[PDB]
Amino acid sequence: KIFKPEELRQALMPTLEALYRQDPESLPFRQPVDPQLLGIPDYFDIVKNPMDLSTIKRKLDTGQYQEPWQYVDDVWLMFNNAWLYNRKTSRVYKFCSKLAEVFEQEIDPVMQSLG
Amino acid sequence: KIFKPEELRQALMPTLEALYRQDPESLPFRQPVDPQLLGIPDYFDIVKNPMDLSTIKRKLDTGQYQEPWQYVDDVWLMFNNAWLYNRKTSRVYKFCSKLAEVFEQEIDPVMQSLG
């Protein structure tokens, strides 16, 4: 099933905007992880394929998604990376769970409406 | 009194490194405040001269300080900006306070040793 870029942007962007409006929980996800700046030099030993909101947003704006599951996969990639790297008790881990909750609620209706 | 740039770097850089060493607490100060990315588009209504650890670091590394009190003033400019802009109860405000404690302790003997 193939979709047009503007169609996916209009359908999917509101679910991404919903993640951005979570404060302070979106803040760890707004730009790409920068290991040197963050003092976490082992980041890419654990995480092989980085992902973040700014990257997902660019892909939606530049027509790089053809099918809604490609977008959903990037969103889950971002969350799975943060769950993998960070300890269960850390502030980033919990912020991640909060965003994933918000995502699960926002994405389901949109996915049913697309078919 | 004229100070050699390499002399100021060697003497003062340990005081900056001590701030960087504060693990969660240095994080809001490691790069310049980015109002669009952080979702705080009034920042520059309130904060007239932004300052942060990476700017202070680059100025020490490239010899932009003529005397020790210019360094010290940038460090307070950073803390005062954060104290001013953010609420008394906010995470950033309280991280600022921990950094400025660490700075108050470290800076006394170094400023004696230069004069």
Ligand SMILES: COc1ccn2c(C(C)=O)cc(C(=O)Nc3cc([C@H](C)O)cc(-c4cnn(C5CC5)c4)c3F)c2c1
């Ligand atoms: C210090 O150890 C870690 C370990 C993992 N991460 C990650 C990820 C996504 O894993 C993200 C970060 C990380 O600190 N991201 C980050 C980035 C930025 C801005 C957009 O540049 C702000 C925050 C942030 C978090 N809370 N706050 C509010 C107190 C002000 C800001 C942030 F966590 C991080 C830090």
Ligand SMILES: COc1ccn2c(C(C)=O)cc(C(=O)Nc3cc([C@H](C)O)cc(-c4cnn(C5CC5)c4)c3F)c2c1
């Ligand atoms: C959400 O509203 C505000 C309002 C003011 N600031 C300020 C300053 C300096 O005023 C700094 C930030 C800010 O979030 N900075 C920032 C940047 C980055 C990385 C280095 O890019 C990480 C953090 C950060 C804070 N806590 N954490 C740990 C949870 C992981 C990361 C951060 F707060 C901030 C956010």
